[PDB]
Amino acid sequence: PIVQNLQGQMVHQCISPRTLNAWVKVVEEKAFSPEVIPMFSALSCGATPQDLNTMLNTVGGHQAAMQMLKETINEEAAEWDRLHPVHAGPIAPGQMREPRGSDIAGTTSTLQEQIGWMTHNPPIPVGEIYKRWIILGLNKIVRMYSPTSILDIRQGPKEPFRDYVDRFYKTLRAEQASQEVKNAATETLLVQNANPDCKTILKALGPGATLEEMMTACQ
Amino acid sequence: PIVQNLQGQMVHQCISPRTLNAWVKVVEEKAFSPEVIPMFSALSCGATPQDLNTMLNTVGGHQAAMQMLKETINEEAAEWDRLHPVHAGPIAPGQMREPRGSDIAGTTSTLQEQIGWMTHNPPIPVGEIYKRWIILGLNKIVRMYSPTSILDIRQGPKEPFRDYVDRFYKTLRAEQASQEVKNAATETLLVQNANPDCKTILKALGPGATLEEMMTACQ
Amino acid sequence: PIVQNLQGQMVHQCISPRTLNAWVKVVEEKAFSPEVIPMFSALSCGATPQDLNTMLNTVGGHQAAMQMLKETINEEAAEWDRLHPVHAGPIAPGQMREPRGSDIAGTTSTLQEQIGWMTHNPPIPVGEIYKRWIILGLNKIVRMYSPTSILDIRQGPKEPFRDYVDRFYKTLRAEQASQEVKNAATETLLVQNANPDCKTILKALGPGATLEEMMTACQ
Amino acid sequence: PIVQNLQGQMVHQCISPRTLNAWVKVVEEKAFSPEVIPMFSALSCGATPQDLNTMLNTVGGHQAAMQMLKETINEEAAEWDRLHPVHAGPIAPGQMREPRGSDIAGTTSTLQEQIGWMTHNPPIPVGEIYKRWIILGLNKIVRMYSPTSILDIRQGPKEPFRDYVDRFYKTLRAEQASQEVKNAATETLLVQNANPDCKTILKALGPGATLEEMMTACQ
Amino acid sequence: PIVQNLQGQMVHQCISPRTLNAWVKVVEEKAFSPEVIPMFSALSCGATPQDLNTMLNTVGGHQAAMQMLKETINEEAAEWDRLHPVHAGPIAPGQMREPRGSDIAGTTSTLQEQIGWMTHNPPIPVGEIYKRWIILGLNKIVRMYSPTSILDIRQGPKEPFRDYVDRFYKTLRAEQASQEVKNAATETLLVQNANPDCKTILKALGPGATLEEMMTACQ
Amino acid sequence: PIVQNLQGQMVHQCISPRTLNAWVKVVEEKAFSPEVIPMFSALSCGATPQDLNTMLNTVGGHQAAMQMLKETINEEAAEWDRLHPVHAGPIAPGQMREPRGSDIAGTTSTLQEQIGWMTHNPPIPVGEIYKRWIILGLNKIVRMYSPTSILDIRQGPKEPFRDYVDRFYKTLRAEQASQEVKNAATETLLVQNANPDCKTILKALGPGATLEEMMTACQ
Ligand SMILES: CN(C(=O)[C@H](Cc1cc(F)cc(F)c1)NC(=O)Cc1c[nH]c2ccc(O)cc12)c1ccc2scnc2c1
Ligand SMILES: CN(C(=O)[C@H](Cc1cc(F)cc(F)c1)NC(=O)Cc1c[nH]c2ccc(O)cc12)c1ccc2scnc2c1
Ligand SMILES: CN(C(=O)[C@H](Cc1cc(F)cc(F)c1)NC(=O)Cc1c[nH]c2ccc(O)cc12)c1ccc2scnc2c1
Ligand SMILES: CN(C(=O)[C@H](Cc1cc(F)cc(F)c1)NC(=O)Cc1c[nH]c2ccc(O)cc12)c1ccc2scnc2c1
Ligand SMILES: CN(C(=O)[C@H](Cc1cc(F)cc(F)c1)NC(=O)Cc1c[nH]c2ccc(O)cc12)c1ccc2scnc2c1
Ligand SMILES: CN(C(=O)[C@H](Cc1cc(F)cc(F)c1)NC(=O)Cc1c[nH]c2ccc(O)cc12)c1ccc2scnc2c1
User: Fold this and answer.
1) Residue whose CA is closest, atom 10 of ligand 2?
2) Which residues of B touch A42 (CB under 8 A)?
3) Residues D37 and D120 in one domain
4) C92 with C157, same domain?
5) Range of the structural domain that residue A203 is part of
6) Residue F112 CB partners (closer than 8 Å, separation 6+)
7) Which of B17, C211, F6, F18 could form a disulfide with D6 if both were Cys (CB 3.0 to 4.6 A apart)?
8) How far apart are CA E73 and CA E67, in angstroms?
9) How far apart are CA B170 and CA B166, in angstroms?
């Protein structure tokens, strides 16, 4: 990654064994549960493209997912190239060249080039641009590997309401509900999918109840 | 987080793998036992809003609780906006803009903006403001998930007094008793809820006994 | 805590995850065995009052003990206030104010205030003052939770002398014997509580024997 | 390794116990799965030839592989020597000498020499050159130890498509398919090797389907 | 401990959780096996008297041993006082005072005093002096807890010679043989205590055989 | 060890708990497998003689080996003294004295002396000299504890060739074959010791086959 040192300057540091191990372990334990994405983001703080590729390459399993991620990256890189075509022909001696999509993804750029872009004034934040593409791909994979529709999350007759709500919002997270549903699912589907006894109580609360109020009512 | 370096200056540092792992593990092990809150507070020392969101987002389960926390945050952010309305229209070039509630919660602000607010002279401590909202929400969740009323903590006939007192004050902590009860429960309910033999002894101690004195008397 | 940096200056640093985890684990494993106190002391090196409260608050169980500790703190804080009354009325702008007992215990003071006191020339060492109160309380709890009188530590007929002496001095430590007994128990109770065969040998050694000499004699 | 310090200068640092342990453990756990290579690369960031030899020498098992790796190194070192012959006869006093292949591999050079080459302006990056030879050898070993032809990865009649695709691309990775196959295997062999029911569906998708589309179709 | 910082100056640093944990664990696992002493010495690098007391106080069991160690310390402190009596009467304002034995052992000195002695030019190395007393005491305890005489280490008829020699020198280490025996036991008791078959072979080697030669001969 | 700090200067640092633990664990797990030597070398980067003795002394078992190592050290120290006799009689005040063999081994020198030698311009690298003696001794022990002759490593009739080659080169490593055999054993004994079926195939490959080619042929 690129870090600031103790005297305020941006320099390259090796990825730590701790970081490497943390990432491998989170993939091993959590697969593509939604919470893997914020963990990736955090563990890739300051990452170069080379570092991001390192992280992805350390994943041993989940190769269907890793191929989908490559496809996503290739699409974003192609879009980059449409928006930001570079002049061809030899680079001015000693001067920074313009990154193409493949350079952002670290396939056709050196570490030295990546460092140069990321620490330029003003910077071309190739680490952050690539990380965005990766996260886009990861979110697609999370959605793919989500096993259950929100339509199929219904409170059992002997299921505590809190347990149901846990399942409901964990499923919405994976399914990657748009903000309206996340926000309002409370008013709609959460009540509809409750068991008959809790549904009766929730209906009687009337509109605008907080989740705290609902959970209290159905305790 | 924002830390001071070795030469006395405030700069941004990535959240460490150790910090990330510690938080996930404490939620995994302790759920919303009251002691999770001081651990959150400690692990989020110097945190930006982005860091706080990272921490919250790394939680995989407990999604009912995480939705209640969002609701709490939204309420505090709305109150912020009522107390501190911002001027609309384009920002003066190069100048710090005023944070709205959504900016404090990290949904509409960049890391660079957050750093700028937190390190301004004087600072707008958006990390600490957001952390307060989060802790407010966490305390509500602790109360919610507390399973037992203090009224139902009564000393068994074969239960050592110390074991009872442990249960009593652990329950009061979760229930989030006001200071009077925490302070005085000793004089009131703790004695009332003791078993007959210990109650007889405690009654005979008369008023103002310390907890040490009570525990000695009922050993 | 407040630490010196690499250039010799006293600044605030966040409590580390390692420190936090070490403390929780020592309480989990050792409860209020006497050796918990030196571990607390060591793990709270340089601690502010805020840090000390963090450490105490991270304890999930042992709430009878934690309430006794609060009582101890309240007594010491009240004594502080009797010895060091503060002038009331508004503080001189920009100037350090005088700490009350509640400020030392971190209930009515900010982190910024605590830092200011601890790093003043000359300092008001509020961390060390509070730590002393806490340790006083912890020692009371160690004594309380000590299960066995020294009077009841007697060498079994088939018990190796070393095993007995281990039990004896572990019990004296918890019971918190005054220096005379720690020093001289060797000459008195240790011999009296030995089994008949070892007692006969120890009696014949005559006065002033070292513990090494006693242990050799009864091997 | 050679690292930059806190003031921006390139100096030698000992290989850490953490790095050493991470490498041994990855070989112990993963043998020569393809993901071992990016882990080697990452753990050898900034490595001298001496460090690289340390890493390789810490491997206790897999001695057939380690002998193949030596053979690969010897071939690359011989090629180096053909491309970059050195002048014989005594070195100018005090001056940097030119590295031979054996010097790059760390068999005939000192640590001091390696440091001198790697930190020269301009550098002779002997660590990176040697690392390339090692990675070439490691890739040969990965291919060797790959147990299964891609021709033999066929979807079972009761095997979820995702599970099949996982096996397929994990095998292609080890077999070290050229870019065309990695890229296009999707259009060819992946469909051919699918079970009859999924094959029927995939055929009907027509050309140019993304892997995401295929996986959705065969869910 | 007192350490040098990054700019070459001697300052106080808190004892780390890692150091604390390492020491407790070595006592837990190894008791008073001889190898505990070098581990103590290493973990107490740069220690103040306060740090050394911390380390000793963190030991929960082995209280017979810890009381013997106190006795040893008291003897060394008394000898210190006989060799280095201090002038009584009030200290010159602002000036370093002379340490007594109790000050070296950390019972009557502050951390500030200890730091002052250890960093004086020239220093009064109270940490190293106390550590020597402790190590003297620890060595006595190692000898005490050594269960077996070297006279009783004899090679079994079916025992490999190497296994016997392992037992022999492990016992000599604990028994704390003087240099002559350590050096020459090879020529004497090691042969005498070998089984008849190996003894016959060793006798025929004649004088001055290395241990390597003996072990080869009896393989 | 002696390390460079963050400003480029050579100073003494305590051996870390991590280093100590890593070494003990590698001896516990691996005994005197050949791979222990590179691990020793790596963990003793920058070590003083005092540090090296610390490392060796922390080993609890394997005392036959540790006595052989002492013997090796004594021989090398005696040779040092024959090659580099020192002038007797009192040292010039304030001046560096010349190390004898016992000083290099850390038995008759202080830490301060060792630091002085190692950081002199030009240095007398007593750490590296002693480490060489230790490694010489360790290699002798590895050879000693190697249980099996290369003559006895023969491919089983149902043993995969790769498994055989693993055993073969692991045995050669321990036996510490000279370079010719390591290099050429491939052409000779490896084929001779193969099972009849693989031997037939290898014979037909003719001379100069790589190990990769052999392993492919016998798959
Ligand atoms: C520069 N770069 C890389 O080193 C990527 C990084 C990467 C990207 C990703 F999206 C998923 C990953 F698991 C690993 N790694 C690989 O190509 C290695 C590999 C993994 N599984 C594989 C399965 C089959 C196979 O024949 C190779 C691989 C790279 C980076 C981005 C893209 S987009 C298309 N190709 C690339 C290549
Ligand atoms: C900027 N920001 C965030 O990245 C929050 C941070 C956060 C806040 C919180 F209160 C609880 C959490 F678990 C996570 N994270 C998420 O929205 C992701 C998520 C978790 N569970 C979910 C369940 C369903 C779903 O469709 C999304 C999520 C954010 C931060 C504060 C608020 S208040 C209303 N929305 C937001 C969004
Ligand atoms: C500022 N301050 C604190 O944050 C203390 C720190 C503390 C002190 C202590 F002695 C024991 C502890 F476990 C925790 N923490 C708590 O009050 C929280 C708590 C723990 N168990 C509880 C059981 C019941 C309950 O309703 C609250 C708590 C604080 C600090 C000192 C004193 S003395 C009287 N009250 C205070 C409060
Ligand atoms: C300088 N250098 C080294 O210290 C190499 C480093 C190395 C290289 C490698 F390709 C694989 C490894 F496991 C270890 N280590 C060894 O030779 C020790 C060894 C391991 N297994 C062995 C099996 C048999 C044997 O008689 C020795 C070894 C070295 C480095 C490169 C080459 S190429 C030909 N010889 C060398 C020697
Ligand atoms: C300043 N100082 C200390 O804090 C020593 C340090 C120490 C020294 C030692 F030799 C063994 C230890 F386990 C702990 N710790 C204790 O006295 C506490 C204690 C442990 N087991 C005990 C058993 C019974 C008891 O009533 C107290 C203790 C101290 C230090 C040196 C000496 S010599 C005589 N008394 C002292 C006291
Ligand atoms: C300065 N120095 C040391 O502290 C050595 C370091 C050392 C050297 C070594 F080759 C093997 C080791 F396990 C430990 N340690 C010991 O002597 C302690 C010891 C271990 N096992 C023993 C078995 C019996 C015994 O009566 C003592 C020991 C030292 C260092 C080098 C030599 S050569 C001859 N004597 C020495 C002494």
Assistant:
1) B70
2) 14-15, 20, 54, 58
3) yes
4) no
5) 150-217
6) none
7) F6
8) 10
9) 6
- Report the candidate in B127, B120, B121 with the shortest Cα–Cα distance to residue B104: B127
Q: Which long-range contacts (CB under 8 A, 24 or more apart) does B91-97 make?
A: B96/B120
Q: How far apart are CA A201 and CA A203, in angstroms?
A: 5
- Indicate if A135 and A164 belong to the same structural domain: no
Tokens 């193949």 identify what position? D68
In chain C, the number of structural domains is 2
**C108 near B CB under 8 A:** no
- φ/ψ of A195, rounded to 5, equals -70, 165
Q: CA quadruple F94, F95, F101, F106: dihedral positive or negative? A: positive
Whether the Cβ atoms of residue B68 and residue B140 lie closer than 8 Å to each other: yes
Task: Inform me whether the C-beta atom of residue F14 falls under 8 Å from chain D C-beta atoms.
Answer: no
Resolution (A): 1.5
Q: Are strands C10-12 and D2-4 parallel, antiparallel or unpaired?
A: unpaired
Backbone angles phi, psi at C3, to 5 degrees: -130, 160
A window 135-174, beta carbon within 8 A of B: 162, 165-166, 168-170, 173
B41, closest residue in chain C (CA to CA): C54
CATH number at residue F132: 1.10.375.10
C177 lines ligand 5 (CB under 6 A): yes
Q: Which amino acid is at D178?
A: S
Contacts of D178 (CB under 8 A, 6+ apart): none
Which residues of chain B does C145 touch, with a Cβ-Cβ cutoff of 8 Å?
A: 162
Dihedral sign, CA of B76, B82, B88, B92? negative
Buried b (16+ CB within 10 A) or exposed e, F75-101: ebbeebeeeeeeeeeeeeeeeeeebbb
Do B16 and B81 sit in the same domain of this protein?
Answer: yes
For residue D61, the ligand closest to its alpha carbon is 4
Element (H, E) at B74: helix B63-83
Could you say which of E145, E180, E206 is where a domain stops? E145
Please report the DSSP string for A112-167 in residue order: HHHHHHHHSSS---HHHHHHHHHHHHHHHHHHHH--S-GGG----TTS-HHHHHHH
The Cβ of residue C17 has, within 10 Å, a number of other Cβ atoms equal to 22
Same domain, F174 and F192: yes
- Flag if A61 and D18 touch (Cβ within 8 Å): no
Degrees, nearest 5: CA angle F71-F73-F77: 120
Looking at the structure, tell me whether residues A83 and A165 fall in a common domain: no
The CATH number of the domain where B163 resides is what?
A: 1.10.1200.30
Q: Do B212 and C64 touch (CB under 8 A)?
A: no
Query: Does A122 sit behind a cis peptide bond, omega within 30 degrees of 0 on the bond before it?
Result: yes
- DSSP assignment, residue E2? E
Q: Per-residue b/e over D113-138, b at no fewer than 16 CB within 10 Å?
A: bbbbbbeeeeebebbebbbebbbebb
Tell which of F145, F161, F176 closes a domain: F145
| Residues F190, F218: Cα–Cα separation, whole Å | 12
Measure the CA–CA gap between C128 and C117, rounded to whole angstroms.
11
- Subunits with 3+ C-beta pairs closer than 8 A to F: D, E
Method: X-ray
Q: How far is the CA of B173 from the centre of ligand 3 (A)?
A: 9
B128 at interface of C, judged by CB pairs closer than 8 A: no
Is B178 exposed, middle or buried, given 0-12, 13-18 or 19+ CB atoms closer than 10 A?
exposed
| Residues A218 and A194: beta-carbon distance below 8 Å | yes
Whole-number Å distance, alpha carbon A70 to ligand 1 midpoint, is: 6
Is residue B41 domain-shared with residue B134, that is, in the same domain? Answer: yes
Neighbours of B95 (CB within 10 A): 6
Q: Scanning every residue of chain F, which has its alpha carbon at the shortest distance from the alpha carbon of D145?
A: F162
> In this structure, what token pair is assigned to residue A122?
């003003």
Say whether both E82 and E120 belong to one domain: yes
> What span, in angstroms and rounded, lies between the C-alpha atoms of A69 and A133?
9
